[PDB]
Amino acid sequence: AAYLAQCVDYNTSKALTVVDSDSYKLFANPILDKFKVNLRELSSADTTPPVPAETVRDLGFEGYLSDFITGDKRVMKMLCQTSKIHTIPVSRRELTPAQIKKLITPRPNGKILFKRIIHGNRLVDIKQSAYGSKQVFPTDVSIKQTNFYQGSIMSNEQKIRIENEIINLKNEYNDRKSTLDALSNQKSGYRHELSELAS
Amino acid sequence: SRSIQNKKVELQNIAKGNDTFLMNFDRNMDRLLRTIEQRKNEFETPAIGPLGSLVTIRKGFEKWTRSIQRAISSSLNAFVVSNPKDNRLFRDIMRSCGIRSNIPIVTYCLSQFDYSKGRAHGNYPTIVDALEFSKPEIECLFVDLSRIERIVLIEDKNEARNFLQRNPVNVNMALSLRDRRSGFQLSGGYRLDTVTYQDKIRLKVNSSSDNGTQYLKDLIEQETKELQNIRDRYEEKLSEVR
């Protein structure tokens, strides 16, 4: 989940998956006016990793972000095409520095092997300056965990507060019921006295 | 009322002058800058900072001065380093000085270069034209990394959509005005995002912080108006019920 949140921005992670731009407009006209929610169009790019997972794992990886998440077919397809999770060699093992520097140097194929990788709890993006020295340069940033993409309680505090509210309201209901019973007893006594007086 | 109080607190903090440009990026950002300057031994390119003085907001763009501030303040935290050893030294100095925030590392030596290869050719002046640049090395680094030379600041939502549909020479991003609280970021021809302007002015603005103080005062006034409207509506409801 942390890897998905790092590779796929939270705006896209909160964005509604839309099949096409036409439906995007047609269903954003009534929705965006009410609630400002990002909409990510279902693209049509590649859905499979560009290279076999063996070559990726030769650097010390495990697989890809596409392999590391599941979910709705259209949403997963949009993630694989727009965000291209399958193009991200993702792992929970940090790469060896030798292979890291091998990736820093452009590969003999003409470019770097990958522009976005995840090793351990860190993410490395390798880019190149458009002009000037145009050095092929990496960038490593630590990856932080999150509870997204997990239908689990963590507002746990809200659950406890609501349970306390349930208990208090049930107790109040029982107390009111007891007061009603007392009122009924008083009414019965009054009616008994009235019957005695009438007799 | 809590939102109004938070806006008042922000107004007081900005007005006191404690929201200094040096501390705008982070409270201990200056500590990190001093440490990298003192520990740029492995840095073939010094991790020069702060870049807000070198990359300041320019007038005529107060419509998205906050939007440009947000964008290039998210992008500004990336400094210039040469080799991954410099990234390790950056992490070491972060652990040493204990900077409250984290600085992304760009492993590219500073160099000055022409960006006319992908210069934006549109009616809207580029972000480079929207920013005062002092150091040519830092200016070139920002242009290359952020691709601001391929961006024209289109001023309206549908105008941005149409202009991106036209796709002139190097037109990728559009920063349109909706209000002083939030604006529009547009890309992809029809991709539109309503983005709230960044409250913390990390990016240096040539205009004094008093503009931010007055903006926060206006925000407080509008939120008090909203509070009054809500209170009156609920008072009407409760009066009818009673």
From Swiss-Prot, chain A:
PTM description: Sumoylated by MMS21.
Further comment found in the protein's record: Present with 892 molecules/cell in log phase SD medium.
Top-level taxon in the UniProt lineage: Eukaryota
Positions of the UniProt region annotated as Flexible hinge: 1-153
Oligomeric and partner information: Component of the Smc5-Smc6 complex which consists of KRE29, MMS21, NSE1, NSE3, NSE4, NSE5, SMC5 and SMC6.
Complete-protein stretch covered: 498 to 696 of 1093
Annotated domain remarks: The flexible hinge domain, which separates the large intramolecular coiled coil regions, allows the heterotypic interaction with the corresponding domain of smc6, forming a V-shaped heterodimer.
Name of the protein: Structural maintenance of chromosomes protein 5
Job description of the protein: Acts in a DNA repair pathway for removal of UV-induced DNA damage that is distinct from classical nucleotide excision repair and in repair of ionizing radiation damage. Functions in homologous recombination repair of DNA double strand breaks and in recovery of stalled replication forks.
Family the UniProt entry places it in: Belongs to the SMC family. SMC5 subfamily.
Subcellular location: Nucleus; Chromosome
Swiss-Prot record, chain B:
Region (Flexible hinge): 45-210
Subcellular localization, as worded in the UniProt entry: Nucleus; Chromosome
Signal sequence region: none
UniProt domain comment: The flexible hinge domain, which separates the large intramolecular coiled coil regions, allows the heterotypic interaction with the corresponding domain of SMC5, forming a V-shaped heterodimer.
Entry similarity comment: Belongs to the SMC family. SMC6 subfamily.
Chain's role: Acts in a DNA repair pathway for removal of UV-induced DNA damage that is distinct from classical nucleotide excision repair and in repair of ionizing radiation damage. Functions in homologous recombination repair of DNA double strand breaks and in recovery of stalled replication forks. Probably plays a role in structure.
Subunit relationships: Component of the Smc5-Smc6 complex which consists of KRE29, MMS21, NSE1, NSE3, NSE4, NSE5, SMC5 and SMC6.
Note: Present with 339 molecules/cell in log phase SD medium.
Protein name as catalogued: Structural maintenance of chromosomes protein 6
